[PDB]
Write a protein that binds this ligand. Structure first.
Ligand SMILES: OC[C@@H]1O[C@H](O)[C@@H](O)[C@H](O)[C@H]1O
Ligand SMILES: OC[C@@H]1O[C@H](O)[C@@H](O)[C@H](O)[C@H]1O
Ligand code: NA
Ligand code: NA
Lengths: 548, 548
């Protein structure tokens, strides 16, 4: 049904033995909780003092004054490295398990293996194979951080966002606040450090992806939750992150159920104050990222998660040092009363959107939808529906290079950035098909990058098969033709300014042009270009019009 | 840790294969839901019409006027047959997993196998072995209903209460409202019908044990609960029954998780109206029980569960036909406001008890506690802490026959009934240790039953090692000596009435007496009784004093 004999399908090893980390959850409680909470209190005091003295305060109106940096307007393309324990099984259904975004989520395997993907998991991995048994298999033996950064550079990308910490809480960086980190578990390396160092060497802006909430977190409680609870003073914190109905805010903690899904996480009293805030601060302080990509901010509203404090801190510590940016996923600004009204209730969506007030730019996922092209936005997606590696993904399931380039041009014409997801396997190897699409995009950008990087939308974004961008200064208009226009390029959209010159990017030759009497621009195409226009540029041909 | 090589420990068979019931939950939705809801609506209408026309109305004040039947005052001993799918694994910890009652619960295994007992389950049965894989192993090959009824008769019991439907919803009777029944799953017989027929044959009062709520139940919903839900219009209803925090009222339904926990259950729109009420009515109508033993009434308050309607119906359908009784487990009469106050908040216990207003008699579980001996009460317990079969139970864990008989006499002198739990294994065989205790109790009752059945508390319940009962007609006082009194029985407690005669039950000798000057009754005991009084009666010696 789900178990194939296809070599490409990751599956249970014949030598599988349970991963029992050196420290049980109770061991971490006894040995590390007090120490961590002590350290957290000191770090939170420092962060709060920085915010009290700093330009940015933890409130919507203060943070709103922060502006999108020039570099982020100009970047247009980022690489989103979706790699983590979920990369080992590398599975979602090719069809039929799409979320409301239209994507599919191999990167939700650690959660969905217990419900939506349980039949697959039980047949391919085994019911006795727990979430944390994927951690030792995340070897990174084929993961080369410099090669990933160079691939991103060569693709034309201007920022690189690793999945530094996703919903199950494994950190790509060596954290003092969790043993569920890349040094203790999986590759045995500070993967984030390697990527940060590579990004500095290649002059690449670096992101920090950070799940605000986690699916489960062991917490210290005064009173137990039921007569069945086996362990005094420990429970499991759960919020809305999982999306499915669950016990909230606390579930009863049972070692035989929970320990092998939360290996390495040190119990604390207050998930947000004692763990989330100090771990965020730690990564910002150590790695100095250019960009914060919150995720999982729907778990708890910001009145509880305190992400306005992490946002203010990030901006404050950047002052005078570098220009930085935050996405719009910190969480909701709504009051308890407004959150209740939404749950009770089109009318629910209007109230919800009113509470989405934090961040520098919008983050449509997979489907672009009805974007406001007057504000900055970024669409995230891979070359397929899949966020995270899908061993089944292939030529049939993935965009062609041609489709990817045309989609990219569309995005950029409409004021968007593309944050292009790449998804390695458990070894850290990138599938050849994803490598190929990056190479093809890179080859196209070699010719056409000046019509993409550092541009802005024009008064018109699309005309038939043409997409427009303009130089920052207004003096160059770029016409991206998604069909080879043949003998003649005709542009119907009025161009008020006089024209100094027109050229096809990829040719050093200046093109002929005249204005017809109906208003159209007519651009004859050299006979020598017709024989094989793909030699100049594949898929999309860009004409630069220099204005007076 | 948990898997022994003890043959007595039930464990995974080498020939185990998954039980995938011929009707999936979705099959039952498509094929049976409409039919069941059609029948339910008609049955609820009939039940409501009976209550409108009947003497008892579904409100606290009306139901309170119903009185404990003479037969229940007189019975003193019932047998509580704790048999179900949980009987197969037959496990709870010998120590350390007691609930707040002081008992332990092998009969919660179907629920606790996923949390508290998960380490045991994984080691002994396997992670791939689901709750419903116990159902085919509940063979009943050693279960003879006539033999169980005769065991009850011969023990001195006057009522027999089978676990007709416990918290996972397997019915001992052949129900039209569920395929999770004893005919379609497990023994392939209407076990309840067999027991009811035996009870009629042997003139035994018959109970109907009924879990109001169930741990999980598939329900039909207009809107799905999450973007992850695989099946339109089905979800899982959950209330407070499970005691541990859970999603309530609804969890997302996932076939690969839920189907092998809820085999046989037919989805309905309203758990209470479309399933609970008509299934209750069905069993009452078909089997004509003398007693309703509600359980699991803490799931939902009676405003939602509607158990005042089932209680009124039970009384109304019996009126003019037979005298019947209900325990006190229908559920809470508290308002939503009062239930909220209890959750917020010793103070919580006072409010909770104020909302416990339904039923004919109290049901202390395991621990008797501070019972009101002016009202009728019944303590339920097995010979050990274990409710349900525990394969580990032995001489060290169980009451001796001696202890059982003395506890029983204590209960009866204090106006209680003992509802003695007996716990068979998966085959339906009763463990030898429980058989031994029942033999001792039965042998004791053969001699002493007239001092137990049809008696009432006396003006004094206990004098040193002596417990008193009196015949309901006042003409006999029974003195139960828990120590052999030796050469003389001396009774300090004044007996105002003249004495016609005195006898030790088990002997035909009339005993002489004198009243001393201090007031004491002095009863010389025959020399021939002194060497071996245990021949006459074991453990407790009962003297019958006939009064004027
Ligand atoms: O594009 C980022 C995606 O964002 C979602 O919010 C997460 O829940 C997914 O796992 C991640 O892949
Ligand atoms: O006295 C009956 C016991 O009553 C409890 O309420 C149930 O939850 C137990 O399973 C059962 O053994
Ligand atoms: Na702003
Ligand atoms: Na009453």
């Amino acid at each position: 049904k789900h178990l194939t004999d296809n070599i490409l399908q990751p599956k249970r090893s014949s030598d599988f033995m349970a991963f029992k980390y050196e420290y049980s959850t109770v061991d971490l409680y006894r040995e590390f909780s007090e120490s961590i909470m002590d350290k957290a209190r000191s770090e939170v005091e420092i962060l709060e003092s920085v915010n009290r003295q700093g330009r940015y305060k933890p409130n919507v109106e203060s943070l709103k004054l922060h502006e999108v940096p020039e570099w982020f307007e100009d970047a247009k393309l980022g690489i989103f490295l979706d790699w983590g324990p979920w990369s080992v099984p590398g599975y979602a259904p090719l069809k039929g398990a799409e979320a409301s975004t239209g994507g599919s989520y191999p990167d939700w395997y650690e959660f969905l293996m217990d419900n939506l993907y349980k039949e697959y998991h039980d047949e391919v991995w085994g019911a006795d194979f727990r979430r944390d048994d994927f951690l030792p298999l995340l070897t990174g033996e084929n993961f080369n951080s410099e090669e990933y950064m160079l691939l991103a550079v060569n693709s034309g990308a201007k920022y690189f966002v690793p999945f530094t910490k996703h919903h199950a809480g494994w950190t790509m960086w060596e954290s003092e606040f969790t043993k569920r980190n890349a040094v203790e578990m999986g590759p045995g390396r500070d993967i984030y450090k390697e990527l940060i160092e590579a990004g500095k060497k290649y002059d690449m802006k670096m992101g920090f992806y950070f799940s605000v909430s986690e699916w489960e977190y062991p917490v210290i409680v005064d009173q137990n939750l039921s007569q069945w609870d086996p362990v005094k003073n420990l429970a499991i914190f759960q919020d809305a992150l999982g999306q499915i109905p669950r016990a909230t805010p606390l579930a009863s903690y049972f070692p035989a159920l929970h320990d092998r899904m939360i290996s390495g996480k040190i119990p604390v009293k207050d998930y947000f104050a004692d763990y989330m805030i100090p771990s965020f601060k730690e990564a910002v302080d150590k790695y100095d990222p250019d960009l914060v990509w919150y995720d999982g901010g729907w778990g708890s509203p910001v009145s509880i998660s305190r992400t306005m404090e992490t946002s203010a801190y990030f901006y404050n510590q950047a002052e005078g040092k570098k220009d930085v940016v935050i996405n719009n996923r910190a969480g909701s600004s709504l009051s308890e009363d407004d959150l209740i009204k939404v749950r009770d209730l089109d009318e629910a969506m209007k109230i919800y959107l009113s509470g989405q007030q934090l961040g520098d730019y919008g983050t449509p996922e997979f489907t672009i939808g009805d974007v406001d092209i007057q504000s900055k936005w970024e669409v995230c997606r891979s070359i397929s529906p899949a966020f995270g590696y899908n061993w089944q993904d292939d030529e049939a399931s993935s965009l062609s290079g041609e489709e990817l380039i045309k989609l990219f041009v569309d995005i950029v014409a409409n004021n968007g950035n593309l944050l292009l997801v790449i998804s390695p396997d458990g070894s850290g190897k990138l599938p050849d098909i994803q490598k190929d699409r990056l190479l093809e995009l890179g080859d196209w950008m070699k010719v056409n990058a000046e019509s993409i990087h550092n541009t802005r939308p024009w008064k018109v974004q699309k005309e038939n098969d043409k997409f427009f961008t303009k130089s920052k200064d207004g003096k160059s208009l770029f016409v991206h033709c998604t069909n080879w226009p043949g003998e003649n390029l005709i542009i119907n959209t009025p161009i008020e300014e006089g024209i100094k010159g027109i050229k096809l990017l990829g040719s050093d030759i200046n093109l002929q042009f005249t204005k017809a009497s109906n208003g159209n621009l007519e651009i004859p195409i050299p006979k020598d270009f017709q024989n094989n226009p793909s030699l100049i540029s594949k898929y999309v041909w860009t004409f630069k019009i220099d204005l007076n």
